[PDB]
Symmetry: C2
Subunit: 56 residues, 2 copies
């Protein structure tokens, strides 16, 4: 278990935690607003993915 | 422009900001770790989406 591996795992734990907080907050908005936010999260996750592939 | 609309927009601005920070940090991990994190973000965005649809 390298230090960097611990950092990657912490990042994953952070994302899981943040996601649960977002669910709680989204429940406070209207359906269409929830849809807009979820779409943005999805699109941003994919741009990150392509950005990592590009910087290779 | 309702208060709730301002909250939704702030949430979007927060997600954009967090995403840019994640790009910076992912560049510090190995390719396979980057792939693992990006996949988790993508899967979590979709679970959120389905969770919002379910709670309707």
């Amino acid at each position: 278990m390298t230090k960097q591996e611990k950092t990657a795992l912490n990042m994953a734990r952070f994302i899981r935690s943040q996601t649960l907080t977002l669910l709680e907050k989204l429940n406070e908005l209207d359906p269409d607003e929830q849809a807009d936010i979820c779409e943005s999260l999805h699109d941003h996750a994919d741009e990150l993915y392509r950005s990592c592939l590009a910087r290779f």
